[PDB]
Amino acid sequence: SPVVVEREREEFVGFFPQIVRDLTEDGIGHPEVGDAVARLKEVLQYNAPGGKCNRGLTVVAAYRELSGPGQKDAESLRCALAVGWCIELFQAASLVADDIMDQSLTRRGQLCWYKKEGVGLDAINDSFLLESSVYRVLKKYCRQRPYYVHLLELFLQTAYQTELGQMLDLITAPVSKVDLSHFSEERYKAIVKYKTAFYSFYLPVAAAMYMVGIDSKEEHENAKAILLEMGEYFQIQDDYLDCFGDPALTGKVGTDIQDNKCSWLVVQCLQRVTPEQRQLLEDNYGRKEPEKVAKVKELYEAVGMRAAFQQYEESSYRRLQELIEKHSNRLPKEIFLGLAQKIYKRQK
Amino acid sequence: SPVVVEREREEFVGFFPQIVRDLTEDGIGHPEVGDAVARLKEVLQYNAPGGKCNRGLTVVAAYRELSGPGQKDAESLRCALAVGWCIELFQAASLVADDIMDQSLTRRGQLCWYKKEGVGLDAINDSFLLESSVYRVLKKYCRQRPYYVHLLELFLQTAYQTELGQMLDLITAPVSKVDLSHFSEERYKAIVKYKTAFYSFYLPVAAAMYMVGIDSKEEHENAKAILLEMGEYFQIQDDYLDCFGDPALTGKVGTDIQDNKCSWLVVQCLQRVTPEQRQLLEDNYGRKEPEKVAKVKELYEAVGMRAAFQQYEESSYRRLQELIEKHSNRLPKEIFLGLAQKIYKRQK
Ligand SMILES: CC(C)=CCC/C(C)=C/CC/C(C)=C/COP(=O)(O)OP(=O)(O)O
Ligand SMILES: CC(C)=CCC/C(C)=C/CC/C(C)=C/COP(=O)(O)OP(=O)(O)O
Ligand SMILES: [Mg+2]
Ligand SMILES: [Mg+2]
């Protein structure tokens, strides 16, 4: 709704300070670690809040769709919130990290934490502590709940798989030999599956599943099934709406290619190509010069992107629905729909 | 003994490959993450093995002293081993990290992992995955044991506190204002308590305690009591044997001061000092120039270090014993002795 969802949207946001107090109130003052926990705070305040929170919100949306009238107590609802910021923290850590390794300058509207003078490389540790923050919250809010371990285990599992995906990227994207060789569809989409899909779609719906009880192994499998497509499309999509479309564009409007970024666009490009363009774009890609950058677009355009994007997004919402009605016996479809209704939209 | 201990010393070492197989055998081949897990291996092989392992060994020593004839099965002994490498991994992660932030060149005899061309900043992620490796092993070997959570929780707790200590260092030691201001005893020793003491002395004996059952809160407290002194002295000591003594010196023989390293030596120095030396050493410290470096020694010498070192190490082994016989009702003293018998030795 253009009503309830926004409210939840605000409950969650109203919850920060709390987690923030949670995280350090006691720390601020320890005649030993005091300085430390006080930095922690700002590392926390500068970094975590700032996205749309839609990841974290997701948990709360699902727990809502999943619990029963017994399990709607204030007390339950809080955790649902807690376990939410936990995903919102997980991602901070990560993206604080990514920033350093990618030597970026800007994030979510402001300057990278590593960039703040005084800070620099120390961010490596600040990242590590954001990571901790996550298991410091779950411990506080869930430690006495049948699903504690299931949660400890989920988060911990997911960081590994994501750490792998990231780790994949790094290798795949390097300007030593720049290369458009090892930009394989199968590779791209493995980068996708692992660096964003798990922590972005699975971890929260799944975390909702364990808190109401559904700890069935092949029920998690029936989730992973559906959601991973959605995480794939979603990223593919986020890939198009970066160069191929603009009107009212949210997230961050502007663009890349300057960054040798492995992106559906290119991948697609590189196989509707011939030795002529193949060098055209393999030449002026990954480089930030208005002719080039603005020129590689041309080639994409020269090959016809919004087509495959179309025969893409056309195929998915199809594939998706099916996947639901083969994977949705035991879990309210309202869930995968909700995600749908706010994830599949596109721009020509 | 100049016998059994070395054998354990070798059982443990013989255990690596295994953990190594554990960690990746299945991974090496996944037609998605394969490249990733294959790098993982070498990140693993280059980094983890190489110390003396005395940290990890400690666990096994304690479990041995602690279990009963029922709990000496091969199967139990293995975990004891497993949970050992887990500390050996925890520290890799860490020190891979420290290397980058400190811009060092060399480690445990070889060149830093970040330094290997091709690698560089990617190490930030390699560190993160070494971290994971730790919860990937405990899950494999303990997941079905009453103390699983107690262990998950111990490791996780300890990284936080250590991450804080590290985080303390960073702040305390910076050459913007270089400073010998915020080199406070109380600060130093807080850096000690938190960046090395917990993961070096508490985490393994404690982990031994939870695996035999002693999960008594004020029994952990009776451990933390004793061991933390030992971790303090131990580091203080490691501090003296770096500049003040040399014959047959183990770990790494050579030295520092080049590194504005906060070290008992200095701290001590800086309060048996006057405005004259105070600038002498506050001048030529943290700097690598044979006059200086070799000159600040002089001042230490000019103030008389091996004295306090003496009235130090003299006071401790005292304080220590007491702490044992006030903290050792429920836990075999043979344990804190063993650590003693191989931690307190000194060099004039
Ligand atoms: C759990 C954990 C702490 C893992 C450590 C490894 C790490 C730094 C992973 C990055 C995850 C991620 C979403 C990166 C951003 O992608 P991107 O390269 O596309 O950069 P972008 O957001 O600027 O587009
Ligand atoms: C658990 C975890 C992954 C924490 C991340 C934070 C981090 C990098 C901590 C460093 C711990 C440590 C023993 C550093 C070495 O000390 P040192 O500066 O004295 O350097 P040195 O060994 O060369 O003497
Ligand atoms: Mg980046
Ligand atoms: Mg270092």
Curated annotation (Swiss-Prot), chains A, B:
Swiss-Prot/TrEMBL catalytic activity: isopentenyl diphosphate + dimethylallyl diphosphate = (2E)-geranyl diphosphate + diphosphate; isopentenyl diphosphate + (2E)-geranyl diphosphate = (2E,6E)-farnesyl diphosphate + diphosphate
GO CC term (a single one): cytoplasm
Positions bearing the site annotation: Important for determining product chain length: A93, S94
Gene3D superfamilies: Farnesyl Diphosphate Synthase
Binding site for isopentenyl diphosphate: K52, R55, Q91, R108
EC number(s) stated in the UniProt entry for this protein: 2.5.1.10, 2.5.1.1
Molecular function in Gene Ontology: (2E,6E)-farnesyl diphosphate synthase activity; dimethylallyltranstransferase activity; metal ion binding
Localization in the cell: Cytoplasm
Binding residue positions for dimethylallyl diphosphate: R107, K195, T196, Q235, K252, K261
Protein name per UniProt: Farnesyl pyrophosphate synthase
Species this chain originates from: Gallus gallus
